[PDB]
Symmetry: D4
């Protein structure tokens, strides 16, 4: 009766980073995909050419449908945020990070076009 | 997926001609990314053979039996021998030796540890990287 | 423009003591060439499809363009007439041969560039 | 493939905002297995040459066919006029390493350079 | 004989590197030099930093504290804080990528602590 | 109170193979080095250029001191089936003789080291 | 008649970094260890827990004897620019100090070995 | 230091292992022990066997011959069969290699001949097998 399961596509918010396309996965060492810290976390892998992973709170996850959600996610996170935080959040990503974000989105949209089992077999990053 | 006999992470015994019934786990093809196919008229599942030197194959459902534990192996042998050629029966009942006996034993140890786990955890621990 | 095969082309290869095997023409990971002349008679570097991949320099005379599994029967009967060969493969080798066929038929359903990017075995 | 400006193995200079024009090679995505796509505007997948290789989907407008190092000065002066400094340290070394790899790759037939310089991922 | 040093291979410690928070670590052998401790008059131990992006270093014994759990971190910070700029920096709570990796390390160290030293060595020794 | 511990050098006997230079190690997956199958087993790594690993019974392990033990191990195993004895005393050849030799060279180099150092140098990665 | 050869231990200077313990090695892709750019360069590998590599000019290389040279290298490098001198003499800290220290430890162990043995142990795989 | 031995790291040799044909090899350091030669009264060298499935071994100097090219293989076989006092050993030695082993032997020769066309430093950097 949990909201997300292994293979589910999510957007994750990490402070200092834009909403990033992710996939819920098992921790390569701890072999769990969700845990309690009173507050639920899920283990995610960040999509793109330089993959990363983290334990992200459910409050910082939104179900991924496509790229078109990103604008609303920014404007909603800006309205919920400190005067300096809002001006920082609405600012568009550039350079290396813009390319990697774009690469992530391309991988996530390709993953979305697949059945959960097939995308787990293709897009689960090996560690 | 909820409609097939087996799913990714399920533990099965696989029979390959010339080999004993082997402890396996149903898994995604590392290249083709499918775990089952029709060869439609006959279903196959992609399995990984447990042990210190892992292998993988597409095995017909007719050659798969749900894994419960080591105690099933004797019945599987005696049933396969009764279903089998005069030379095939004498070969099937003969107990495994050397390198293959060790690797079979190692597989059994891995399968029994995998069986003591929830499907999600065993997929995350026992899925062999290729 | 004069070679019969190019990198990414799907072929059947015959190695003495083995059945006609589903392969793909590839570059040598060290020598970086896909074809050479042994001496008068052309060879191509191929990768044998399956769960346990291998590679070799095979003579053009031992290569046939891969269309699908349906060719295997004729390849056997033709090799037998030119010569054990007619006897069907079993055990581990039958499984690996089957796995190769499955990989080759998936590779055949793809554009040459995509199949090179997906099925070129890393060494 | 015979209809696009670039193909797998072609050497190009790539411009990424905040980075100098970089010696690259057109290649297939190691995951998606495509080398070009449309986003109305064509992109090509490239690998950045060097001792620490990277890769990206770059628009055709930000790619220039690589001939040699001698082009870099003009590319900078043209990119400055269209747009408010010479590279140093770690980045200067890695850029230099890319030039060395790209110029070696340019001295080879497309098939051989694909077999030698395609970065494994 | 190893039974004479304060720490041994597999022991869980907190390590302090200037500009970084007290980090959950395990004492391990150098993957190249194959030693876990050395003298520089002053003893050092080779450690691995726990997390999703593992690192390693030769850290002085003076900068190591035996790991019991996360609850020690607050005292370690307040004691390290007690240079004017260094104190204001030390007491400040970690954010972004580093906070996530620190959290991942703690999760790994607390799992490792729930194990016998032989098992934790076999599970948590990072390959190099 | 166990006879062997992680890093200990042993000779292992597997039916159809000569007594082989090994090291007691933790299973890369199960993370245990010993188990009870009433009869104790230890997880070992076979030394050589093509390393292998297995769960071997304590009855089939002998503490490794050096190569000089091999002759006695053969003659004792032979004394312990008529065909099995003639096979056991026969000296190894080809690929297997080379790999056995490579194992002994690695084991003797491992023996010249403190247990911690040999664990850090000779534990095969899986 | 080249000053350096594969396996030789040197100090390399890269702008914005302290003199770093290296070892001359062949380029893992281009298979050359030296080239001319007029001015000779050597391919070096930077010692440490996070190894790197580069083509460094001979003018920015000094034969490595030991850590004791570092102080003189700094004071000699300390640069017509007033800001450059104050930044060069300043001691390294944090992550970089640890990795520099790890490099020195590796270079001094490499120095205690014959060239062939150190090439077989310390050549970083790529 | 290493200027007095017959072979050095990077040198191309043919190696004879009982039950196998004379094989194209390169003298290399042991990936673990980091030595390329040792005494067992009799000198051995660490070699890597060329081919698509590389192997390595410590081979006695008596079983090594400096590699010049493929053309030497016939004489090496003829010399080996003449030195082999056993009647069965001679008939086995002169027999030509087949199947998988013939292909891998061929692949080794192709690699060794490429390696021979290079300076010792370059061939060490290109053909030293990673372990
Ligand atoms: O290709 C990629 C994918 O992953 C990235 C993560 C990051 C990245 O730094 N983060 C923050 C992290 C938290 C835990 C570890 S990483 C994520 C964006 C939120 C930066 C660039 C990346 N590039
Ligand atoms: O560690 C292990 C696990 O896998 C093995 C498979 C085999 C083994 O050969 N097989 C047959 C195969 C089918 C196709 C590829 S392999 C399986 C027993 C039925 C032998 C030894 C093994 N040792
Ligand atoms: O999955 C696979 C793919 O490759 C194989 C090759 C072989 C196999 O042994 N060969 C012969 C070879 C010649 C050169 C190297 S290998 C090829 C079939 C003709 C056996 C099993 C395999 N299984
Ligand atoms: O050796 C190398 C090669 O690649 C590099 C890329 C970069 C580098 O950061 N970039 C920007 C990127 C966009 C997408 C991913 S990386 C490229 C120069 C434009 C920096 C240093 C490198 N060093
Ligand atoms: O997942 C992880 C684990 O290791 C890290 C180390 C560091 C990190 O940078 N350090 C400093 C180092 C000294 C020697 C090499 S690295 C350690 C915290 C003190 C940063 C992020 C990490 N993330
Ligand atoms: O370099 C090496 C080291 O390991 C080997 C094991 C074997 C080898 O086959 N065995 C039997 C095995 C039991 C379990 C898995 S392997 C061991 C000798 C007893 C053969 C050759 C080897 N070569
Ligand atoms: O463990 C290590 C070893 O290598 C490093 C290089 C560097 C490092 O960044 N450099 C500069 C480089 C030039 C070419 C590529 S890298 C070298 C010190 C001069 C930083 C940290 C390192 N840590
Ligand atoms: O591609 C290759 C290269 O190496 C091989 C070695 C062997 C091979 O088995 N040997 C014997 C060995 C002794 C020590 C380890 S291996 C060598 C030929 C004499 C067989 C096939 C090979 N294929």
């Amino acid at each position: 009766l949990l909201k997300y399961n292994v293979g589910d596509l999510v957007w994750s918010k990490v402070s200092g980073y834009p909403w990033w396309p992710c996939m819920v996965s098992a921790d390569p060492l701890l072999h769990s995909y969700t845990k309690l810290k009173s507050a639920r976390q899920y283990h995610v892998q960040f999509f793109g050419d330089a993959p990363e992973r983290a334990w992200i709170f459910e409050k910082s996850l939104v179900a991924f449908e496509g790229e078109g959600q990103f604008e609303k996610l920014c404007q909603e996170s800006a309205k919920q945020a400190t005067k300096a935080e809002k001006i920082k959040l609405l600012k568009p990503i550039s350079g290396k990070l813009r390319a990697q974000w774009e690469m992530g989105i391309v991988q996530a949209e390709e993953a979305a076009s697949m059945s959960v089992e097939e995308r787990k077999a293709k897009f689960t990053f090996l560690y």
